[PDB]
Scaffold this active site. Structure first.
Site, PDB file in Angstrom:
ATOM      1  CG  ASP A  48     -51.203  40.788 -15.218  1.00 30.04           C
ATOM      2  OD1 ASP A  48     -50.650  40.565 -16.319  1.00 30.04           O
ATOM      3  OD2 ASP A  48     -52.132  41.620 -15.183  1.00 30.04           O
ATOM      4  CG  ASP A  90     -50.416  37.890 -18.566  1.00 26.56           C
ATOM      5  OD1 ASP A  90     -49.522  38.655 -18.159  1.00 26.56           O
ATOM      6  OD2 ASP A  90     -51.589  38.313 -18.673  1.00 26.56           O
ATOM      7  CB  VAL A  98     -46.649  41.029 -20.468  1.00 28.39           C
ATOM      8  CG1 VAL A  98     -45.534  41.161 -21.495  1.00 28.39           C
ATOM      9  CG2 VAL A  98     -46.571  39.688 -19.733  1.00 28.39           C
ATOM     10  CD  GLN A 112     -60.105  41.705 -24.512  1.00 31.27           C
ATOM     11  OE1 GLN A 112     -60.436  42.881 -24.367  1.00 31.27           O
ATOM     12  NE2 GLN A 112     -58.912  41.245 -24.153  1.00 31.27           N
ATOM     13  CG  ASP A 153     -49.698  40.291 -21.918  1.00 35.29           C
ATOM     14  OD1 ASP A 153     -49.873  41.497 -22.187  1.00 35.29           O
ATOM     15  OD2 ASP A 153     -50.228  39.832 -20.888  1.00 35.29           O
TER      16      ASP A 153
HETATM   17 CA   LIG Z   1     -50.912  40.725 -18.828  1.00 40.44          CA
END
Ligand SMILES: [Ca+2]
Ligand SMILES: [Ca+2]
Ligand SMILES: [Ca+2]
Ligand SMILES: [Ca+2]
Lengths: 308, 308, 308, 308
Positions: free
Chosen positions: C9, C14, C122, C225, C238
């Site tokens: 996604d 990713d 993932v 983050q 991921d």
């Molecule tokens: Ca992901």
């Protein structure tokens, strides 16, 4: 005519629903989709095809979900037998399912339509839920959903839950929060359609392929429905959805706010129906209350006679 | 005589139960314990004392739990008013609660007994559950529990739950897993005792302090029970437990396996009742089904006339 | 080579996973399937295609589920921005998605295979769950599932749950009960891959298309983050699944019995991991414990250099 | 001095807590209340009394709840043995429980106080929860609750839950929503206090009644804690609460919003601790993170030597 896609798990009463839907002039049956439920998909598929072959019904049959979306699979062989349609004996099966998966068929048909098609689910809601989440654009395209499932009072498979919902509570949660116009033929209404021996005799007298099939089918659940639930005859639950679409005046409904309980525990798969409106939430479902059985069985006979 | 401890949250129908229990010769009313429920405990205790004073009931009253064992407290002022007993107007209160806490009273009384006492809880089950877990040696000493609570069909306070159980689901779970002989007068039964204007008139003609009190009380819930639940009169739910103990033949019960659902969600506090016996578990409860209202109202009148 | 299908996604990490999977000679990347997660599907699809175009990856991309199987959809725009891949700016999109639905692609590819393909989810597990329940015969065909998701300690999106599982707990329940060999790169391991400014600068110095892309991507989550969670850099969660498949010796796992909690409440979507084996149940998952970050960042740099 | 009531289920480490609390001049031990937990109440009461008699501790002991408030009772005989305190030898008991039930003692003592008493629960929270709901006026009277229970990471009795909470999750829900200042010495901290053979030898060298008792007690859980949880020595979990009140500087806490999960299922009785503050809710607990074991074992030795 009301265009419908009949989603089912044949299933004794499913077969009666197919018989009525495919014959009555007020219904335009576009396709039959099959789901696992009463038995595993390999069996409910064979059962659906067997009925269509025997009654010379010219409608494509699509195989769908063989398992519910999350829970451990259950079956209702206690009511429906090892085959899922014990009772009738069919000639060797020659017709088969379409190549296209039922979920794809449902999505593609709705998306290409002008919003006039009604879904009629009379098994677990697995196909419907997967279609809804796979292609959310189908929602505005659904005219109405007229489903057999649920109970505002006592369930069958558990004290809290009716089989169709219990077999896939998570799928039911999807459907019941879709915001699409919903009609729920629950056990409170459908248990009124007990098919006692005099009803079977009536359809036998009418005769023909459908009369004979009606008798072979409904004689089986006469015993299992009594032994399991104390019912005086096997209800034809699923056929009430077809009745509702032929003439809704034969059925009293009440609008209610309905929620599907997905809690593991004693109410898993319960349809919680706000009968008194105490929660103060807008209704989302027309819940079946009573059926005029004199009207209903007259309609069944008329459909049976259509196959003579 | 059946010796009882009457545990209640007065409360309109609680008052009618008190009136009956204290007067009928088939009942030996040992004590009245009060719990928070319909209103907060300060109010239900005052209401219980006011009723006993008015009717000259010389039975000790003990105050119990002011909060349920785990959940956030709810009240039913929508039915019972801001006082918890709107309707009657009482003289200044001169009687007082005992100093002994209701939970200690219940435990000590049972422990010293010959095993012949019945608990009659007609409010939330908080006192009963605390007593059972605080001194488990009471369990083999309880003759029976005849409680007003639950519903096998539709609840009141929620679609799934009746108020007494909803007000303390965790306490109810304790009581319903106790293994003690249990009788449940749930809403399915008790909603049949709607106290319509003709029934009030009847008790008014009987007259005396109890007839007047009956009228002042039941005229209030006549309005709130209709506004909230569509009921044709206010049921005298709690009085059915006293009726049951006077003559159980007046009430048809069915033995069922009952489970209390403590899941947060749309069935929190539901009594799940296995009407059809599909779970294959032994019954643990005699669940009320029908009441002979001619018998019941006759008995209420008899008790009323006892205070003349 | 390990043949894989990468289900994702995109999503900042990713994109790093795609970059590594498409370039390392130990991975045979058969296809990329896209699911809704970090953002809605229209976006994660565009993000996936953008990355493949930028890096000249000639692997088919298939669009899958736009919503989870049952729950109300959530997104992670707090971490990933409005686009789902804030940071890089791409040239106009000319790369196209395949017409076949990701679920159908997964099922057909597995069914036609000799059982040697590994699934690498993932994102939320929606595509995987639907495939498993739609065609249960895929289960023996899956060599292994190496997924990024879950946490044995603290979650991210909630204290209890990691985002991929939380976004579709019911799908995760399907996957974790599948019986297929399972590896879980959970937050306990992946939070070790904080992409600190020195890591970004290292990849900048490597340069080329992947080096610029890495910088533009990871600079975004550096801020998000830290603000949202403890984190000193954006983890490349991921990409650890790709690293695991290139050299499993770089990661320490522990075999545990893992269960997905689907209860509504404070642990919805939690992966409950039996670290001490107290439940006495056979392990079903290799759970990530520690990663050699020197080995890992070395591998990332190698893959980045591969695009020069 | 900090006045305390120590509520416990002796229990090997409970016994160490009693030994410290009754001796250290920084603690004013008012009373010891006993609850069911590690074993049934008949046993934990005898164990508590035995310890007090052996050590000549002249503090009243009150027997409390023998069962949790709602759930089915569990015990920890796997850790504590059939007696609940396997290991030491005691002379015939002359000490007895006071006549007042522990719940009443807790209420009356708090209500008569100036608000300066701290509760120190180191068993299941049954007594505390019943006291809080029976007399809500105690809440402001409680200076602080310093409890041993919970875990932000992995549980012991289950992967999700620590024993004290698991043994009565509904009582823990009550306590953790009380709003009283709370300190939680959970497993993450207390597992650091493994009592290895060299620690036992240290206390043996100190000698006296407390040194001998310490050795007989901690040699038993040395074995069980290893076999069950892989621990290198039996932790003295409950003693950390007394250490905390003697010198809080020896323990590092972090303020967190903590919620007790009462869902049946794989997280029943979990303390969900918002380590990262992602829920945006104000902290309600000081959660133990680390303990200086060099400080702690020195304090234990000092207490032991006090009995010579
Ligand atoms: Ca992901
Ligand atoms: Ca059916
Ligand atoms: Ca009442
Ligand atoms: Ca303890």
């Amino acid at each position: 005519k009301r265009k419908i896609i009949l989603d089912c798990d044949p299933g004794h009463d499913d077969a009666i629903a197919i018989m009525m839907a495919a014959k009555h002039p007020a219904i335009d049956l576009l396709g039959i989709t099959i789901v696992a439920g009463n038995q595993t998909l390999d069996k409910t598929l064979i059962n659906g095809l067997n009925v269509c072959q025997k009654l010379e019904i010219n409608v494509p049959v699509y195989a769908g979900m063989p398992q519910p979306i999350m829970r451990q699979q259950i079956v209702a062989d206690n009511i429906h037998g090892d085959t899922g349609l014990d009772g009738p004996v069919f000639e060797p099966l020659t017709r088969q399912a379409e190549s296209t998966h039922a979920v794809k068929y449902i999505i593609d048909t709705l998306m290409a339509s002008d919003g006039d098609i009604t879904l009629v689910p009379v098994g677990p809601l697995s196909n419907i839920a997967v279609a809804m989440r796979m292609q959310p654009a189908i929602l505005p395209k659904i005219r109405e959903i007229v489903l057999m499932g649920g109970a505002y009072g006592t369930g069958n498979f558990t004290p809290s839950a009716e089989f169709n919902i219990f077999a896939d509570p998570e799928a039911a949660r999807v459907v019941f929060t879709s915001g699409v116009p919903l009609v729920m033929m629950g056990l409170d209404l459908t248990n009124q359609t007990v098919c006692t021996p005099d009803v079977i005799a009536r359809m036998e007298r009418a005769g023909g392929p459908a009369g004979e099939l009606f008798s072979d089918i409904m004689n089986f659940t006469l015993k299992t429905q009594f032994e399991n639930y104390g019912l005086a005859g096997g209800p034809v639950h699923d056929a009430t959805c077809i009745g509702y679409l032929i003439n809704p005046d034969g059925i009293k409904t009440q609008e209610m706010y309905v929620e599907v309980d997905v809690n593991s525990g004693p109410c898993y798969g319960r349809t919680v129906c706000d009968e008194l409106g105490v929660l103060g939430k807008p209704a989302n479902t027309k819940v079946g209350i009573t059926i005029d059985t004199d009207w209903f069985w007259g309609l069944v006979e008329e459909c049976v006679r259509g196959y003579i």
